[PDB]
Write a protein that binds this DNA or RNA. Structure first.
Lengths: 52, 53, 53, 52, 52, 53
RNA sequence: GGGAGUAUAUGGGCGCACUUCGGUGACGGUACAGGCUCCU
RNA sequence: GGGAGUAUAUGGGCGCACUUCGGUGACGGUACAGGCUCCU
RNA sequence: GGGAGUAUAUGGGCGCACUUCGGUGACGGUACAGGCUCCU
């Protein structure tokens, strides 16, 4: 489908971090999530650059 | 149309080089794991393209 | 002072044109509802101005 | 009173959305709330432009 | 230690406000917290300016 | 190294002037309280510097 | 409703401590009160 | 405390699976550990 | 998943009220439905 839709699908495929646990654990989970988001952004950029 | 999508997927796959088989077993394992994750994402994309066709 | 406030309220009211009585009964109803909401807000303003006088 | 006070009253008259329900429902409620906020901003702008 | 570390220690020494209570009380607590943050920022700036 | 830290602490302390002993007992009290808070923060800093030495 | 700033600001009366009973306390207080300005 | 980035990065030892018992696994792992830099 | 905008926009069928039973209601509705575009 449209590139935008695929990208939205990619962002949808990133699960939110677990709120339970110690502050450090939750912090780590958040950081992992953010890393995933960064990756999604990068690959989304490389997708949008071509394919259209 | 479809050709552009196929070329896109093949491009994404080609842009994902194999992991480095060096260091401890754990290090190699997790490099292979990250790599496999990337591959998995690309396949998710391709499969979604196939699903809408 | 007060004259400016009255002119303001009358201006806001005049700036809110009547809804379009076209289409299905539901469409007309909800146009009238949005319109009535705007009118209600303007009256809330005016009433608050009257309350502080 | 002062225009700013009236505007604050307008923003006070916008109820926060219901957190309960499905993700889609909550999403819709949030969107409605945001629309209301946009309206408040517009009319606040048109008020502040005159009246002073 | 490094100035940055000391500053981080200062920001760590600012306790988050109490979520319990009335809206006005919580508002006040948040404002106090924000004031504390502003202070921390100011003194952090005056520290970083010198000492290095 | 350490000299710069000592100079820093003394500087922070010197940059914190005594409160104003004027007005009601409460006002003076809370000026002294704010002042004491600032002093306390500076000492927290100095003590942390001493702890890492 | 939310936010920013004024703010290295303002200080109100309860409770403790001390007292020569008038008051005093760099004590509870990193508490509490939240005005004014603007933004949303 | 919060955030950003380093990071298309780093990999530690538990449990499974396999085994020629030395090890191996693109298995639990989208888990888990969170250093360094800066911001607040 | 989140956000912005289109939007001073679009209006779908349940329940009330009225009715000449065809319909009507600036009634529940500041409810509810959430498409399209882009961002993350």
């Amino acid at each position: 489908l449209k590139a935008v839709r695929l990208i939205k699908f990619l962002y949808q495929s990133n699960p939110p971090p677990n709120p339970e646990g110690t502050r450090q654990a939750r912090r780590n989970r958040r950081r992992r999530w953010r890393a995933r988001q960064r990756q999604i952004h990068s690959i989304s950029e490389r997708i949008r650059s071509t394919y259209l």
